[PDB]
Coordinates of C-alpha atoms and ligand atoms in Angstrom, one line a residue:
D1 CA -96.6 -114.0 -244.8
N2 CA -95.1 -112.3 -241.8
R3 CA -96.0 -114.5 -238.8
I4 CA -93.5 -116.0 -236.4
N5 CA -92.6 -119.6 -237.3
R6 CA -89.8 -120.4 -234.9
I7 CA -89.1 -119.6 -231.2
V8 CA -86.0 -120.4 -229.3
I9 CA -85.8 -120.2 -225.5
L10 CA -82.5 -119.9 -223.6
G11 CA -82.6 -121.5 -220.1
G12 CA -84.3 -124.5 -218.6
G13 CA -85.4 -123.4 -215.1
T14 CA -88.8 -122.3 -214.0
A15 CA -89.0 -119.3 -216.3
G16 CA -87.8 -121.3 -219.3
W17 CA -90.3 -124.1 -219.0
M18 CA -93.2 -121.9 -217.9
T19 CA -92.5 -119.9 -221.1
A20 CA -92.2 -123.0 -223.3
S21 CA -95.3 -124.7 -221.9
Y22 CA -97.5 -121.6 -222.2
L23 CA -96.4 -120.4 -225.6
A24 CA -96.6 -123.9 -227.0
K25 CA -100.1 -124.2 -225.7
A26 CA -101.0 -120.8 -227.0
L27 CA -99.5 -121.2 -230.5
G28 CA -99.9 -125.0 -231.1
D29 CA -98.6 -126.2 -234.4
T30 CA -98.2 -122.8 -235.9
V31 CA -94.8 -122.4 -234.3
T32 CA -91.8 -124.6 -233.5
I33 CA -90.5 -124.1 -230.0
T34 CA -87.0 -125.1 -229.0
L35 CA -85.4 -124.7 -225.5
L36 CA -81.7 -124.7 -225.0
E37 CA -80.9 -126.0 -221.5
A38 CA -77.9 -123.7 -220.7
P39 CA -77.4 -125.7 -217.4
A40 CA -77.7 -123.6 -214.3
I41 CA -75.9 -124.1 -211.0
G42 CA -77.4 -126.7 -208.7
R43 CA -78.9 -125.2 -205.6
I44 CA -80.7 -126.7 -202.5
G45 CA -84.4 -126.5 -203.0
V46 CA -85.1 -123.6 -200.6
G47 CA -88.8 -123.1 -201.6
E48 CA -90.9 -120.6 -203.5
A49 CA -94.1 -118.9 -202.8
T50 CA -96.8 -117.7 -205.2
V51 CA -100.1 -115.7 -205.6
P52 CA -103.6 -117.0 -206.4
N53 CA -103.6 -116.0 -210.1
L54 CA -101.1 -118.7 -210.8
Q55 CA -103.7 -121.5 -211.2
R56 CA -106.1 -119.5 -213.3
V57 CA -103.6 -117.7 -215.5
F58 CA -101.1 -120.5 -216.0
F59 CA -102.1 -124.0 -214.9
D60 CA -105.7 -123.7 -216.1
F61 CA -104.4 -122.6 -219.4
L62 CA -102.4 -125.7 -219.7
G63 CA -105.4 -127.8 -218.5
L64 CA -103.7 -129.0 -215.3
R65 CA -105.7 -129.3 -212.1
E66 CA -104.0 -128.8 -208.7
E67 CA -105.0 -132.3 -207.9
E68 CA -102.6 -133.3 -210.7
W69 CA -99.7 -130.9 -210.5
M70 CA -99.4 -130.4 -206.7
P71 CA -98.3 -134.0 -205.9
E72 CA -95.7 -133.9 -208.6
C73 CA -93.9 -130.9 -207.0
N74 CA -94.5 -131.4 -203.3
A75 CA -96.7 -128.3 -203.3
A76 CA -98.3 -126.9 -200.2
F77 CA -100.7 -124.0 -199.4
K78 CA -100.2 -120.3 -198.8
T79 CA -103.0 -118.2 -197.2
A80 CA -100.9 -115.1 -196.4
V81 CA -97.4 -113.8 -195.7
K82 CA -96.9 -113.5 -191.9
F83 CA -94.6 -110.7 -190.8
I84 CA -92.7 -111.5 -187.6
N85 CA -90.9 -108.9 -185.4
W86 CA -91.0 -105.9 -187.8
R87 CA -92.0 -103.6 -184.9
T88 CA -89.7 -104.7 -182.1
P89 CA -86.0 -104.6 -181.7
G90 CA -83.8 -107.6 -181.0
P91 CA -82.0 -110.6 -182.5
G92 CA -83.1 -112.6 -185.6
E93 CA -85.3 -115.2 -183.9
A94 CA -88.1 -117.4 -185.3
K95 CA -90.5 -116.6 -182.5
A96 CA -92.5 -113.4 -182.3
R97 CA -91.6 -111.0 -179.5
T98 CA -94.3 -109.4 -177.3
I99 CA -95.6 -106.0 -177.9
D100 CA -98.5 -104.4 -176.0
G101 CA -99.3 -107.9 -174.6
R102 CA -99.6 -109.4 -178.1
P103 CA -97.1 -111.3 -180.2
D104 CA -95.4 -109.0 -182.7
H105 CA -96.8 -110.5 -185.9
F106 CA -99.3 -109.4 -188.6
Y107 CA -100.7 -111.1 -191.7
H108 CA -101.0 -110.1 -195.3
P109 CA -103.8 -112.4 -196.8
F110 CA -105.2 -112.5 -200.2
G111 CA -108.7 -111.6 -201.4
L112 CA -110.6 -108.3 -201.3
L113 CA -112.0 -106.5 -198.2
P114 CA -115.8 -106.3 -198.1
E115 CA -117.4 -102.9 -198.2
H116 CA -120.4 -101.1 -196.6
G117 CA -121.8 -98.0 -198.1
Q118 CA -119.0 -98.6 -200.7
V119 CA -116.4 -97.9 -198.0
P120 CA -113.8 -100.7 -197.3
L121 CA -114.0 -102.5 -194.0
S122 CA -110.5 -101.1 -193.3
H123 CA -111.9 -97.6 -192.8
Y124 CA -114.6 -98.8 -190.3
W125 CA -111.8 -100.5 -188.4
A126 CA -109.8 -97.3 -188.4
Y127 CA -112.9 -95.4 -187.2
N128 CA -113.4 -97.8 -184.2
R129 CA -109.7 -97.5 -183.2
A130 CA -110.0 -93.7 -183.4
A131 CA -113.2 -93.9 -181.3
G132 CA -111.3 -96.1 -178.8
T133 CA -114.0 -98.8 -178.7
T134 CA -111.6 -101.5 -180.0
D135 CA -108.0 -102.3 -179.6
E136 CA -108.0 -105.2 -182.1
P137 CA -105.3 -105.4 -184.7
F138 CA -106.4 -104.6 -188.3
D139 CA -105.7 -108.1 -189.6
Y140 CA -107.6 -110.0 -186.9
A141 CA -110.6 -107.6 -187.2
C142 CA -111.0 -107.7 -191.0
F143 CA -109.8 -111.1 -192.2
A144 CA -111.3 -114.4 -191.1
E145 CA -108.1 -116.1 -192.5
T146 CA -106.1 -114.9 -189.5
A147 CA -107.9 -117.3 -187.2
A148 CA -107.5 -120.2 -189.7
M149 CA -103.8 -119.6 -190.0
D150 CA -103.1 -119.5 -186.2
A151 CA -104.9 -122.9 -186.0
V152 CA -102.8 -124.1 -189.0
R153 CA -105.9 -125.0 -191.0
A154 CA -106.0 -125.9 -194.7
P155 CA -107.5 -123.4 -197.0
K156 CA -110.1 -126.0 -198.1
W157 CA -112.2 -128.9 -196.7
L158 CA -110.8 -132.3 -197.6
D159 CA -113.3 -132.9 -200.4
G160 CA -112.4 -129.8 -202.2
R161 CA -114.9 -127.3 -200.7
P162 CA -113.2 -123.9 -200.8
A163 CA -113.0 -121.8 -197.7
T164 CA -110.5 -119.0 -198.3
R165 CA -108.4 -117.5 -201.1
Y166 CA -105.0 -119.2 -201.4
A167 CA -101.9 -119.8 -203.3
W168 CA -99.0 -122.2 -203.2
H169 CA -95.6 -123.2 -201.8
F170 CA -93.4 -125.4 -203.8
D171 CA -89.9 -126.5 -204.8
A172 CA -89.3 -124.6 -208.1
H173 CA -86.9 -127.3 -209.4
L174 CA -89.7 -129.9 -209.2
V175 CA -92.1 -127.6 -211.0
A176 CA -89.6 -127.0 -213.7
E177 CA -89.1 -130.7 -214.1
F178 CA -92.8 -131.4 -214.2
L179 CA -93.3 -128.6 -216.8
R180 CA -90.3 -129.9 -218.8
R181 CA -91.9 -133.4 -219.0
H182 CA -95.3 -131.7 -219.9
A183 CA -94.0 -129.5 -222.7
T184 CA -91.8 -132.1 -224.3
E185 CA -94.2 -135.1 -224.0
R186 CA -97.5 -133.2 -224.7
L187 CA -96.7 -129.9 -226.3
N188 CA -94.0 -131.0 -228.7
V189 CA -91.3 -128.5 -227.5
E190 CA -87.8 -129.7 -228.4
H191 CA -85.4 -129.9 -225.4
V192 CA -81.8 -129.3 -226.5
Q193 CA -79.1 -130.1 -223.9
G194 CA -75.9 -128.1 -223.5
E195 CA -74.3 -124.7 -223.5
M196 CA -74.7 -121.8 -226.0
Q197 CA -71.5 -121.3 -228.0
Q198 CA -72.5 -118.0 -229.5
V199 CA -75.4 -115.9 -230.6
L200 CA -75.7 -115.1 -234.3
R201 CA -77.0 -111.7 -235.3
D202 CA -77.7 -110.0 -238.7
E203 CA -76.8 -106.5 -240.0
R204 CA -79.6 -104.9 -238.0
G205 CA -78.6 -106.6 -234.7
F206 CA -81.5 -109.0 -234.6
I207 CA -80.7 -112.5 -233.4
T208 CA -80.9 -115.2 -236.2
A209 CA -79.7 -118.3 -234.3
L210 CA -78.3 -119.7 -231.1
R211 CA -75.3 -121.9 -231.9
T212 CA -74.8 -124.9 -229.5
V213 CA -71.4 -126.1 -228.4
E214 CA -71.8 -129.1 -230.7
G215 CA -72.0 -126.6 -233.5
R216 CA -75.8 -126.8 -234.1
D217 CA -77.6 -123.6 -235.1
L218 CA -81.0 -123.2 -233.4
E219 CA -82.5 -120.7 -235.9
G220 CA -85.5 -118.6 -235.0
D221 CA -87.5 -115.4 -235.5
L222 CA -88.0 -114.7 -231.8
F223 CA -85.8 -115.4 -228.8
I224 CA -86.7 -115.6 -225.1
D225 CA -83.9 -115.0 -222.6
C226 CA -84.6 -117.2 -219.5
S227 CA -80.9 -117.5 -218.5
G228 CA -81.4 -115.9 -215.1
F229 CA -79.1 -113.2 -213.6
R230 CA -76.6 -114.0 -216.4
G231 CA -78.9 -112.3 -219.0
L232 CA -76.9 -114.0 -221.7
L233 CA -79.0 -112.6 -224.6
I234 CA -80.7 -109.4 -223.3
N235 CA -77.6 -108.0 -221.4
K236 CA -74.6 -109.7 -223.0
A237 CA -75.6 -110.1 -226.7
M238 CA -78.0 -107.2 -227.1
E239 CA -76.1 -104.9 -224.8
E240 CA -79.2 -103.7 -222.9
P241 CA -78.1 -101.9 -219.7
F242 CA -79.4 -103.2 -216.3
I243 CA -80.7 -100.6 -213.9
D244 CA -79.3 -101.3 -210.5
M245 CA -81.9 -100.4 -207.8
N246 CA -79.8 -101.5 -204.8
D247 CA -79.8 -97.9 -203.7
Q248 CA -83.5 -98.1 -202.9
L249 CA -83.7 -101.7 -201.7
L250 CA -80.5 -102.5 -199.7
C251 CA -80.7 -106.2 -199.5
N252 CA -78.5 -108.0 -202.1
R253 CA -77.5 -111.3 -200.6
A254 CA -79.1 -114.5 -199.3
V255 CA -78.0 -117.5 -197.3
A256 CA -80.5 -120.4 -197.5
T257 CA -81.2 -124.1 -196.9
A258 CA -84.0 -126.6 -196.5
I259 CA -84.8 -128.1 -193.1
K260 CA -86.5 -131.4 -192.4
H261 CA -89.6 -130.9 -190.2
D262 CA -91.7 -133.1 -187.9
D263 CA -95.2 -132.0 -188.8
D264 CA -96.9 -134.2 -186.2
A265 CA -95.6 -131.9 -183.5
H266 CA -97.1 -128.6 -184.7
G267 CA -98.4 -129.1 -188.2
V268 CA -97.6 -127.3 -191.4
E269 CA -98.0 -123.5 -191.4
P270 CA -100.3 -122.5 -194.3
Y271 CA -98.4 -119.3 -194.8
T272 CA -95.0 -117.8 -195.8
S273 CA -93.2 -116.1 -192.9
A274 CA -91.0 -113.1 -193.3
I275 CA -88.9 -112.9 -190.1
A276 CA -87.2 -109.5 -189.3
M277 CA -83.4 -109.9 -188.7
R278 CA -80.7 -107.5 -187.6
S279 CA -79.6 -106.7 -191.2
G280 CA -82.5 -108.0 -193.3
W281 CA -85.2 -110.6 -193.0
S282 CA -85.6 -114.4 -193.4
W283 CA -88.2 -116.3 -195.3
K284 CA -89.8 -119.6 -194.2
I285 CA -91.7 -121.6 -196.8
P286 CA -93.3 -124.7 -195.2
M287 CA -94.2 -127.8 -197.2
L288 CA -95.0 -131.4 -196.1
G289 CA -92.2 -132.8 -194.1
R290 CA -89.8 -129.9 -194.6
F291 CA -89.5 -126.1 -194.9
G292 CA -87.3 -123.8 -197.0
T293 CA -85.7 -120.8 -195.4
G294 CA -83.3 -118.1 -196.3
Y295 CA -81.8 -115.0 -194.7
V296 CA -82.0 -112.1 -197.1
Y297 CA -79.5 -109.4 -196.1
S298 CA -77.6 -106.3 -197.1
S299 CA -73.8 -106.7 -197.6
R300 CA -73.5 -103.0 -196.8
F301 CA -74.6 -103.9 -193.2
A302 CA -73.5 -107.4 -192.5
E303 CA -70.5 -109.6 -193.2
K304 CA -71.1 -113.0 -194.9
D305 CA -70.1 -115.0 -191.8
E306 CA -72.2 -112.8 -189.6
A307 CA -75.3 -113.5 -191.7
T308 CA -74.5 -117.2 -192.0
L309 CA -74.1 -117.6 -188.3
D310 CA -77.2 -115.5 -187.4
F311 CA -79.2 -117.7 -189.9
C312 CA -77.9 -120.9 -188.4
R313 CA -78.4 -119.7 -184.8
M314 CA -82.1 -118.9 -185.5
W315 CA -82.8 -122.4 -186.7
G316 CA -80.4 -124.1 -184.3
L317 CA -78.2 -125.4 -187.1
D318 CA -74.6 -126.4 -186.8
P319 CA -72.9 -123.9 -189.2
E320 CA -70.0 -126.2 -189.8
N321 CA -72.2 -129.2 -190.8
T322 CA -75.1 -127.6 -192.7
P323 CA -75.4 -127.4 -196.5
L324 CA -76.0 -123.7 -197.3
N325 CA -76.8 -121.8 -200.5
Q326 CA -74.8 -118.6 -200.6
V327 CA -76.3 -116.3 -203.3
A328 CA -75.6 -112.8 -204.5
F329 CA -78.7 -110.9 -205.9
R330 CA -79.2 -108.7 -208.9
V331 CA -81.7 -106.1 -207.7
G332 CA -83.4 -104.0 -210.4
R333 CA -84.5 -104.4 -214.0
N334 CA -83.3 -103.9 -217.5
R335 CA -83.9 -100.5 -219.1
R336 CA -86.1 -102.5 -221.5
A337 CA -87.3 -106.1 -221.0
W338 CA -87.8 -106.6 -224.8
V339 CA -85.2 -105.4 -227.3
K340 CA -85.4 -106.1 -231.1
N341 CA -86.4 -109.8 -231.2
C342 CA -85.1 -110.7 -227.7
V343 CA -87.6 -110.9 -224.8
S344 CA -86.2 -111.3 -221.3
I345 CA -88.4 -113.2 -218.8
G346 CA -87.7 -114.1 -215.1
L347 CA -84.3 -113.2 -213.5
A348 CA -83.0 -112.3 -216.9
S349 CA -85.5 -109.4 -216.9
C350 CA -85.7 -108.2 -213.3
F351 CA -85.5 -109.1 -209.7
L352 CA -86.6 -108.0 -206.2
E353 CA -86.1 -109.7 -202.9
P354 CA -88.9 -112.1 -202.4
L355 CA -90.6 -110.2 -199.5
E356 CA -94.0 -110.5 -201.1
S357 CA -93.5 -113.5 -203.4
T358 CA -93.3 -111.8 -206.7
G359 CA -90.9 -114.1 -208.6
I360 CA -93.3 -116.6 -210.2
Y361 CA -95.8 -113.8 -210.6
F362 CA -93.4 -111.6 -212.7
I363 CA -92.8 -114.6 -215.0
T364 CA -96.5 -115.3 -215.3
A365 CA -97.3 -111.7 -216.1
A366 CA -94.4 -111.4 -218.6
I367 CA -95.6 -114.5 -220.3
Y368 CA -99.2 -113.4 -220.4
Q369 CA -98.2 -109.9 -221.6
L370 CA -95.9 -111.3 -224.3
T371 CA -98.9 -113.2 -225.8
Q372 CA -101.0 -110.0 -225.5
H373 CA -98.4 -108.1 -227.5
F374 CA -97.2 -111.0 -229.6
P375 CA -95.2 -109.9 -232.6
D376 CA -95.0 -110.9 -236.3
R377 CA -91.7 -110.8 -238.2
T378 CA -92.0 -107.0 -238.8
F379 CA -91.7 -106.5 -235.1
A380 CA -93.7 -103.3 -234.9
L381 CA -92.2 -101.0 -232.2
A382 CA -95.6 -100.2 -230.6
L383 CA -95.8 -103.8 -229.5
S384 CA -92.5 -104.0 -227.7
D385 CA -92.9 -100.5 -226.4
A386 CA -96.2 -101.4 -224.9
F387 CA -94.9 -104.6 -223.4
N388 CA -91.9 -102.8 -222.0
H389 CA -94.1 -100.2 -220.3
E390 CA -96.3 -102.8 -218.6
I391 CA -93.3 -104.7 -217.4
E392 CA -91.6 -101.5 -216.1
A393 CA -94.8 -100.2 -214.4
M394 CA -95.4 -103.6 -212.8
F395 CA -91.9 -103.9 -211.5
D396 CA -91.5 -100.3 -210.2
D397 CA -94.9 -100.4 -208.5
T398 CA -94.0 -103.5 -206.5
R399 CA -90.4 -102.3 -205.8
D400 CA -91.9 -99.1 -204.2
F401 CA -94.3 -101.3 -202.2
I402 CA -91.5 -103.5 -200.9
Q403 CA -89.4 -100.4 -200.0
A404 CA -92.4 -99.2 -197.9
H405 CA -92.1 -102.3 -195.6
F406 CA -88.7 -101.1 -194.5
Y407 CA -89.4 -97.4 -194.5
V408 CA -92.6 -97.6 -192.5
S409 CA -91.2 -100.1 -190.0
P410 CA -90.6 -98.3 -186.7
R411 CA -87.4 -100.3 -186.1
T412 CA -84.2 -98.2 -185.7
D413 CA -82.2 -100.5 -183.5
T414 CA -79.5 -101.5 -186.0
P415 CA -77.7 -99.5 -188.7
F416 CA -79.7 -101.5 -191.4
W417 CA -83.2 -100.6 -190.0
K418 CA -82.1 -97.0 -189.3
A419 CA -80.6 -96.6 -192.8
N420 CA -83.9 -97.5 -194.4
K421 CA -85.5 -94.4 -193.1
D422 CA -82.8 -92.2 -194.6
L423 CA -83.4 -93.5 -198.1
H424 CA -85.3 -91.3 -200.6
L425 CA -89.0 -92.1 -200.7
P426 CA -90.5 -92.1 -204.2
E427 CA -93.1 -89.2 -204.7
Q428 CA -95.9 -91.6 -205.5
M429 CA -95.4 -93.6 -202.2
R430 CA -95.1 -90.3 -200.3
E431 CA -98.4 -89.4 -201.6
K432 CA -100.0 -92.8 -200.8
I433 CA -98.8 -92.5 -197.2
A434 CA -100.3 -89.0 -196.9
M435 CA -103.6 -90.2 -198.4
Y436 CA -103.6 -93.1 -195.9
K437 CA -102.9 -90.7 -193.0
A438 CA -105.8 -88.5 -194.1
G439 CA -108.1 -91.5 -194.0
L440 CA -108.4 -92.1 -197.8
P441 CA -108.5 -95.6 -199.3
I442 CA -105.5 -96.5 -201.5
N443 CA -106.2 -98.3 -204.8
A444 CA -109.7 -99.4 -203.6
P445 CA -111.0 -102.5 -205.4
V446 CA -113.9 -101.6 -207.6
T447 CA -114.9 -105.2 -208.6
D448 CA -115.8 -108.3 -206.6
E449 CA -113.3 -111.1 -206.1
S450 CA -114.8 -113.2 -208.8
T451 CA -114.1 -110.6 -211.4
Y452 CA -110.7 -109.7 -209.9
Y453 CA -109.4 -113.3 -209.8
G454 CA -111.3 -114.2 -212.9
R455 CA -109.7 -111.8 -215.3
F456 CA -105.9 -111.4 -215.1
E457 CA -106.0 -107.9 -216.6
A458 CA -108.4 -106.7 -213.9
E459 CA -105.9 -107.7 -211.2
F460 CA -102.9 -106.4 -213.2
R461 CA -104.4 -102.9 -213.3
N462 CA -105.0 -103.0 -209.5
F463 CA -102.5 -105.4 -208.1
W464 CA -101.8 -103.9 -204.7
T465 CA -105.3 -102.9 -203.5
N466 CA -106.4 -100.9 -200.4
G467 CA -106.5 -104.1 -198.4
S468 CA -102.8 -104.8 -199.0
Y469 CA -101.8 -101.2 -198.1
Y470 CA -103.7 -101.5 -194.8
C471 CA -102.2 -104.9 -194.1
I472 CA -98.7 -103.5 -194.3
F473 CA -99.2 -99.9 -192.9
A474 CA -101.5 -100.9 -190.0
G475 CA -99.4 -104.1 -189.5
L476 CA -96.3 -102.0 -189.0
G477 CA -98.1 -99.7 -186.5
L478 CA -99.1 -96.9 -188.9
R479 CA -102.8 -95.7 -188.6
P480 CA -104.6 -92.7 -190.1
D481 CA -104.4 -89.4 -188.3
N482 CA -108.2 -89.5 -188.3
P483 CA -110.9 -91.6 -189.9
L484 CA -112.4 -90.8 -193.3
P485 CA -114.1 -87.5 -192.6
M486 CA -117.3 -88.4 -194.5
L487 CA -117.8 -91.2 -192.0
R488 CA -118.5 -88.5 -189.3
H489 CA -121.5 -87.5 -191.4
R490 CA -122.8 -91.0 -191.7
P491 CA -123.2 -92.4 -188.2
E492 CA -126.0 -94.8 -189.3
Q493 CA -123.7 -96.3 -191.9
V494 CA -121.1 -96.8 -189.1
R495 CA -123.6 -98.5 -186.8
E496 CA -124.7 -100.8 -189.7
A497 CA -121.1 -101.7 -190.7
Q498 CA -120.4 -103.3 -187.3
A499 CA -122.4 -106.4 -188.4
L500 CA -119.5 -107.1 -190.8
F501 CA -117.1 -107.3 -187.9
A502 CA -119.4 -109.8 -186.3
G503 CA -119.5 -111.8 -189.5
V504 CA -115.7 -112.1 -189.6
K505 CA -115.8 -113.2 -186.0
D506 CA -118.4 -115.9 -186.9
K507 CA -116.3 -117.1 -189.9
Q508 CA -113.2 -117.2 -187.6
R509 CA -115.0 -119.7 -185.3
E510 CA -116.5 -121.7 -188.1
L511 CA -113.1 -122.0 -189.9
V512 CA -111.1 -123.0 -186.9
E513 CA -113.7 -125.5 -185.7
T514 CA -114.5 -127.3 -189.0
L515 CA -111.6 -127.0 -191.4
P516 CA -109.1 -129.8 -191.6
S517 CA -105.5 -129.0 -190.6
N518 CA -103.1 -128.0 -193.4
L519 CA -101.2 -131.2 -192.6
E520 CA -104.3 -133.4 -193.0
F521 CA -105.0 -132.0 -196.5
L522 CA -101.4 -132.2 -197.6
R523 CA -101.3 -135.9 -196.6
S524 CA -104.5 -136.6 -198.5
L525 CA -103.1 -134.8 -201.5
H526 CA -99.7 -136.4 -201.4
Ligands
LIG1 N1 -103.0 -109.2 -206.3 C1 -102.6 -110.0 -205.2 C2 -102.1 -109.1 -204.1 C3 -101.8 -109.8 -202.7 C4 -102.5 -109.9 -201.6 N2 -101.9 -110.5 -200.6 C5 -100.6 -110.9 -201.1 C6 -99.6 -111.5 -200.4 C7 -98.4 -111.8 -201.1 C8 -98.3 -111.3 -202.5 C9 -99.3 -110.7 -203.1 C10 -100.5 -110.4 -202.4 C11 -103.7 -110.9 -204.8 O1 -104.8 -110.5 -204.4 O2 -103.5 -112.2 -204.8

């Protein structure tokens, strides 16, 4: 009899309660689950963005429909990330500057690009730009979602009819609270209030119990560290080193707040914005009646007061009379996410600036992979080693992807933007950029959207597809040196492919003209 009987989780934020809920649903009565609150510092709800797999991987597993959980956490919709002013110099401002007679913005939507002759639509767009017969931006040519988002449409018709692939904006504290109620009332997880006095270990350094300040020993076989940047178990108790990656991603601070919004004026933007600043970038996460916003910056390039004032100036806030969250970031990951019988999940495990909304996703993936590699009490090394490799490969892949946004940006007008070009580029990303310039697809999707979004593992093995690389590279002004050479041998395939551009144009009109506003759906939902 070697199976796990007791699990103890340290930390009661988003990571803690997502972990408690999922594992309790997965294991049922076979395991007792106990979560020790370890109270975190109370922050303004500054918003959080997600990716589509959240519903299928997580909420569907718990049996919770969006119609049920979204009203409980004031959730709203995300169709893309909108990048503002990453090509033009200037101050940190909310509005896009003008470049070549167009606003300086580009979108990074979800979903997979359609293909013709098994070549992605991106390559036909590149061919037409090279041929000089179009001057249309990549995102407006290849995604119908762009038109929807400019007209601030919902991603669905009011009666549930799907239109476009989407994810969510919400206040993470409300979600944690909703999940806490769910896990304790429905999944028989025991919530224990208070601080951890000490962590009890045996002769082999495995954890045997968490001792609470009232002297109670929370005994277990497996321990999940969800204590955030503190890493109270994985870093402090187990002495696992954290690998600082601030050398590669310079931003390490944020100043943030939530701002009340009059939605009747201009609606609710169904996308997360990432607004380029003098020494970093600011997020905007719109929900009904209010949006969350924060300036992510690098302390090597801006003073605290500088950032704070720039942030407030952009939103027209009085810096003296505005509640602000001032946060220092831990950028990087543990050498290993799982050590002995301690598994770190969430900020305890790793962190990147939220440029592409990876936070909740990293938790979800960690949770999912923990169940895929779930141990018994022998704790076979091959299980944790495999888990650690998947977590490491996931993190480093996205870290490199994020770095590319700053490296490929043409901006050089401040020391921050200029310093990004001086940073070492990882060999794998150097290769990707050279492939892209030669006209090759990068990580082309080989399945349809139904398979990709249907099976988590299909997406996990191909998370940043060709579409995403084109969104960012073409978005930032980088195009291939020449189109895919094989296309010059297939003119008939090229002539045929143009109908797909006509289809996107048709969808763009249809969506704008018949979809309800994001605002209207949110009011019907809430
Ligand atoms: N695998 C993700 C990739 C992705 C596309 N667009 C994004 C925008 C933000 C974050 C991730 C993404 C998805 O298709 O959903």
